[PDB]
Design an enzyme around this catalytic site. Structure first.
Site, PDB file in Angstrom:
ATOM      1  N   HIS A 191      43.682  41.334  38.757  1.00 38.20           N
ATOM      2  CA  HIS A 191      44.466  40.548  38.509  1.00 38.20           C
ATOM      3  C   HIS A 191      43.654  38.960  38.334  1.00 38.20           C
ATOM      4  O   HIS A 191      42.961  38.897  39.061  1.00 38.20           O
ATOM      5  CB  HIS A 191      45.686  40.098  39.508  1.00 38.20           C
ATOM      6  CG  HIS A 191      46.479  39.178  39.543  1.00 38.20           C
ATOM      7  ND1 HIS A 191      47.030  38.803  38.364  1.00 38.20           N
ATOM      8  CD2 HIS A 191      46.776  37.931  40.573  1.00 38.20           C
ATOM      9  CE1 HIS A 191      47.926  37.732  38.377  1.00 38.20           C
ATOM     10  NE2 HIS A 191      47.744  37.216  39.975  1.00 38.20           N
TER      11      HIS A 191
ATOM     12  N   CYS B  91      45.273  40.486  30.342  1.00 37.56           N
ATOM     13  CA  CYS B  91      44.959  39.920  31.531  1.00 37.56           C
ATOM     14  C   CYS B  91      43.626  39.022  31.162  1.00 37.56           C
ATOM     15  O   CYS B  91      43.787  37.665  31.299  1.00 37.56           O
ATOM     16  CB  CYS B  91      44.719  40.660  32.803  1.00 37.56           C
ATOM     17  SG  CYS B  91      45.840  41.192  33.636  1.00 37.56           S
TER      18      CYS B  91
END
Lengths: 293, 75, 284, 76
Positions: free
Chosen positions: C134, C67
């Site tokens: 996220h 990520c």
């Protein structure tokens, strides 16, 4: 004695101190203590109580020392003027030039008893006319406890005009300035109270115009050198942008002063004579006001 | 009529520059002679103020709460 | 790939280990406080319709736990190489993906070894692989802020500006949810170069001391000018020293984050049990 | 101790800079040899006050309590 009640509004107090001859002074309202302000002359604190319920720490100063300006408020409705004089009259004449009608008082009451030092405040007419000159017309009579925070020499004195003795806090660390010690005493408090806190700083325009001089001199030092045939244009660019920034700042300041002048010129006016003549002029022709609740 | 008659109106909105602009000049001038030192076109905030609104409210209250009919010639 | 700690220092040292010298990642605490020339923003959650030509870098994240690398590469690789010097092994990738499909550009990310070694080089020993943070990347190409989500298939656009883009970013904070420990960071260039530049543009005026004497046969007592601006020079000096000290701090936290302490603990305890000095006070 | 001997202690407080200063020099040096590259006889007290050192001791007791890393751990 008997004075006039006043609205608590930083503009009213600024124009009050201007009407006291102390020009190079100013009162701005502080919304958070974290944002720093340059050279605060002293702070002012205001309580209120809506539901009364009140009927308004042993760190008092017992020794009969009246070398500092402390005066028991004997004149009613003089809370604000007493607090302002309490924050001004205990500062350095080196740092600020106070009005002659103020300095005359400060030098007149050397070591006087507070119980009649506040009476010396009450007796000065050119002060009562200026304080009463700002009362709303609804002061037709025939709350807001003020507490002044000012240091004298590294000692943060909490001056209460209604309490008989001045409260000292005695904060001294060579690592921090006194404004750092002021926030530590701000352990306040929280129910329905309409408190308010203001700060007494010097007139910002005096610190601005000086910066416009110390800037416009470098604006004037433009050394265009020719070898008959380094390039620091970006420097004059950046400092010119600074000049524009401080220009808009100063314009904002004079606009604030004008705004306070307007709010003061409307706060004083008594609208009654205006309303009657107005209504009769409508009821002369336009009787039908269909805006009933 | 200062005898507690139709005092229940919302004067703050009744007295606007539009209702003001419904008056002859030789009366509007006499009106601004009773205005604050903002006398010198009209600065719309001149009739939208905290002090002007509270003034009109203390006025209609000052009429309803206690009549200021011609009894009011005490000095 | 391996999970990493979400910490602006870790990302700063990551980009430093990526050759990008004129870069830094600071955390923004309020949108009102302006920061100069932000190259792009990164968005992080903790508890949980706009638009062809995919010539821009929107590589779909296929490698799990990547990520952070995905967000940083998403905000950097859509900027001007003119404005910043990215590492040659990074620019080679940037030119290695001319108009490539995003759905397999992330595989080109996965194949780059100096990316797995450097990104995995900062993972705690607790990286044993067998709701979440996220990442959402905000970078403009030309007045249009594309919200790049590595998990969503399409990048979301928010609009233009009015010339009166950092102002447009605050306009997108009209989001209500309903419960979330989100956090937002900003990718700026290394502050120290913008500091040293000001130290030059200041020390020239420090050097311009026009001492003129009226003792022999605008200009007045201006000692206070050089005094105050000298104090300004000292202020920016302390700023720069604070910044390099922050870099030292990140180096310490990085050198301790990587180290595996178990072998140290065993030897320590056994060295206590060598002379029978147990912990017969602390327990439970 | 491979599985379960005095594993119920609060090691984060047991392993402090003082217990380190209670060791001979020719053993303390061996200790700092197992420290990170911040090696360079004093101890930078923050060296033993870290989030990562505490998390190390806690994942250590976990590595001991949850599943023993005894010679059983030769599943490779």
């Amino acid at each position: 004695d008997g004075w006039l009640e006043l609205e608590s509004d930083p503009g009213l107090f600024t124009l009050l101190l201007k009407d006291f001859g102390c020009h190079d002074v100013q009162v701005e309202e502080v919304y958070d203590l974290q944002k720093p302000i340059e050279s605060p002359y002293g702070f002012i604190f205001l309580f209120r109580w809506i539901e009364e319920r009140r009927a308004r720490i042993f760190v008092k100063d017992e020794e009969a020392i009246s070398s500092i300006f402390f005066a028991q408020q004997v004149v009613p409705n003089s809370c604000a003027t007493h607090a302002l004089l309490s924050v001004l009259l205990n500062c350095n004449e080196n740092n600020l030039q106070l009005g002659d009608t103020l300095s005359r008082l400060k030098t007149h009451t050397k070591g006087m008893s507070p119980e009649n030092k506040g009476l010396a405040i009450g007796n000065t007419p050119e002060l009562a006319c200026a304080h009463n000159s700002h009362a709303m017309p609804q002061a037709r009579r025939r709350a807001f406890h003020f507490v002044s925070f000012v240091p004298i020499n590294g000692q943060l004195f909490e001056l209460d005009g209604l309490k008989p003795y001045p409260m000292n806090h005695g904060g001294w660390e060579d690592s921090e300035d006194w404004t750092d010690k002021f926030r530590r005493v701000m352990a306040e408090r929280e129910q329905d109270i309409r408190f308010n806190l203001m700060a007494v700083v010097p007139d910002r325009r005096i610190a601005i115009t000086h910066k416009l001089k110390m800037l416009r001199t470098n604006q004037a030092i433009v050394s265009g050198t020719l070898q008959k045939l380094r390039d620091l244009q970006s420097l004059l660019k950046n400092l010119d942008t600074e000049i524009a920034i401080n220009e808009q700042h100063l314009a904002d300041e004079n606009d604030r002063r004008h705004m306070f002048k307007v709010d003061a010129s409307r706060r004083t006016h008594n609208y009654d004579k205006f309303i009657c003549t107005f209504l009769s002029m409508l009821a002369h022709q336009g009787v039908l006001g269909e805006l009933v609740s | 009529t200062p005898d507690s008659i139709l005092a229940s109106t919302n004067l703050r909105a009744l007295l606007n520059k539009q209702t003001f602009s419904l008056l002859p000049p030789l009366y509007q001038y006499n009106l601004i002679q009773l205005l604050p030192s903002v006398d010198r076109r009209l600065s719309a905030s001149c009739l939208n103020n905290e002090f002007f609104a509270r003034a009109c409210l203390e006025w209609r209250e000052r009429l309803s709460e206690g009549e200021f009919t011609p009894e009011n010639q005490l000095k």
